[PDB]
Amino acid sequence: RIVGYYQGIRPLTNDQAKKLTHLILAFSTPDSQGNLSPLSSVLKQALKAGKSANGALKVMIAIGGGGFDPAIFTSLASNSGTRKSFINNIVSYLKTNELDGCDIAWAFPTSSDKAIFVTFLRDLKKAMAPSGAVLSMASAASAFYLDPGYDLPGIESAVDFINVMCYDYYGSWTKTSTGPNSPLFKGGSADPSDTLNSNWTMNYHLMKVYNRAKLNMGVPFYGKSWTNVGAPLNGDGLWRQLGTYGTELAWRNMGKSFDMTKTTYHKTAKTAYIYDTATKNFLTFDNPQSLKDKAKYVAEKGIGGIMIWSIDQDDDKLSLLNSVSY
Numbered sequence: 393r394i395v396g397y398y399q400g401i402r403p404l405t406n407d408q409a410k411k412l413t414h415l416i417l418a419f420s421t422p423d424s425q426g427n428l429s430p431l432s433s434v435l436k437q438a439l440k441a442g443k444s445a446n447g448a449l450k451v452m453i454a455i456g457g458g459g460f461d462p463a464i465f466t467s468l469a470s471n472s473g474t475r476k477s478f479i480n481n482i483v484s485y486l487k488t489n490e491l492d493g494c495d496i497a498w499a500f501p502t503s504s505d506k507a508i509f510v511t512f513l514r515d516l517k518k519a520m521a522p523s524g525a526v527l528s529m530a531s532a533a534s535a536f537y538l539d540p541g542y543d544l545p546g547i548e549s550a551v552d553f554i555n556v557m558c559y560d561y562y563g564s565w566t567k568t569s570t571g572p573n574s575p576l577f578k579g580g581s582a583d584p585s586d587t588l589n590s591n592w593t594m595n596y597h598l599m600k601v602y603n604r605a606k607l608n609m610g611v612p613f614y615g616k617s618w619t620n621v622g623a624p625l626n627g628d629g630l631w632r633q634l635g636t637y638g639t640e641l642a643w644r645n646m647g648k649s650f651d652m653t654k655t656t657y658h659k660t661a662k663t664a665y666i667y668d669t670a671t672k673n674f675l676t677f678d679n680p681q682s683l684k685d686k687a688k689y690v691a692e693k694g695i696g697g698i699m700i701w702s703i704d705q706d707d708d709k710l711s712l713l714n715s716v717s718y
């Protein structure tokens with residue numbers, strides 16, 4: 393599988409559509425009653441572009457998302473009556489909007505949600521099964537969220553695949569140092585963390601699920617910046633004194649603001665970063681090399697596919713998607 397999430401940053405091109413097996417439009421959100429927000433114009437355009445260019449492509453709607461209040465999912469899913477009506481609305485929405493499935497993006501289920509989340513996904517799949525609509529969900533990357541909220545065997549028993557979000561390992565909340573948004577591995581002896589890497593997150597999933605073919609390893613087409621960054625903490629320039637958080641930058645916008653010839657490729661972590669000694673700017677990101685190393689890992693581990701957040705962040709020449717694709 394090559395599962396591409398899509399945010400409406402720019403049109404979906406005919407070339408992109410052919411490189412995916414699944415296109416996940418993001419997002420629709422439910423209200424407190426379980427009514428889904430209408431599909432936006434930019435997302436509807438991508439549905440049409442995708443199906444026109446690739447008649448095998450499955451176009452799905454992601455429901456929820458990182459900005460969406462998880463207490464609304466709690467409310468809808470915990471009451472058997474509202475669960476039923478929410479599910480019926482989801483299935484009606486797929487029909488009305490000519491969609492092939494849906495992704496539940498609940499950020500994040502708590503310990504009180506763990507069992508009802510599984511019931512919701514099981515009951516949703518039952519309602520979707522006659523039409524063959526594809527069901528997926530997005531899963532977290534650290535034990536902090538995974539252990540309380542995610543019964544991975546129960547989830548697996550309901551869904552067609554699990555989109556594992558192996559990114560956002562460092563970010564605006566980080567107080568200790570710079571670090572990689574999405575490395576493949578722990579970065580050697582200077583790395584202060586054993587777990588903030590894609591390999592740890594995927595291994596956690598591999599030890600819990602029955603069939604690893606049901607997993608997709610998520611990869612980001614964006615990176616993150618800090619400014620006023622200082623010296624390495626322990627001899628390795630990936631982890632540097634802070635500094636002020638910048639923002640999340642799509643790949644397509646990085647090279648206009650950073651000199652990409654200064655890229656450092658961390659050979660142990662398999663991650664790309666730039667520290668600019670003239671400006672003290674820092675950029676952690678994924679590039680063609682990091683994605684090639686990640687695709688190789690997915691194949692080596694027998695993981696069922698690669699998920700991308702998000703394909704519209706790629707440049708006009710599809711540097712990132714072609715690296716995953718080729």
Ligand SMILES: CC(=O)N[C@@H]1[C@@H](O)[C@H](O[C@@H]2O[C@H](CO)[C@@H](O[C@@H]3O[C@H](CO)[C@@H](O[C@@H]4O[C@H](CO)[C@@H](O[C@@H]5O[C@H](CO)[C@@H](O)[C@H](O)[C@H]5NC(C)=O)[C@H](O)[C@H]4NC(C)=O)[C@H](O)[C@H]3NC(C)=O)[C@H](O)[C@H]2NC(C)=O)[C@@H](CO)O[C@H]1O
Binds near residue numbers: 530557
């Ligand atoms: C207090 C403290 O220190 N606590 C930490 C705790 O923070 C650590 O965990 C980390 O927490 C953060 C914040 O909760 C997590 O960051 C979330 O993670 C979400 C899942 O990865 C992520 O959403 C998914 O990923 C996409 C990219 O981030 C999202 O895209 C964004 O969507 C927006 C609309 O919804 C849009 O406006 C944005 O432009 C867009 N961004 C980009 C770059 O495209 C997307 O919504 C979502 N996709 C899906 C399929 O659901 C959140 O965006 C991200 N939040 C922020 C604010 O950046 C982070 O994942 C946690 N890390 C780990 C490893 O689990 C915790 C562990 O270190 O420790 C505690 O101590």
Ligand SMILES: *[C@@H]1O[C@H](CO)[C@@H](O[C@@H]2O[C@H](CO)[C@@H](O)[C@H](O)[C@H]2NC(C)=O)[C@H](O)[C@H]1NC(C)=O
Binds near residue numbers: 591592
């Ligand atoms: C990828 O992650 C796995 C699991 O965390 C690592 O394998 C572990 O390696 C440690 C030594 O560092 C062993 O003590 C464990 O027994 C291993 N666990 C499993 C489940 O195999 C693996 O080394 C990581 N790969 C890289 C390149 O860092």
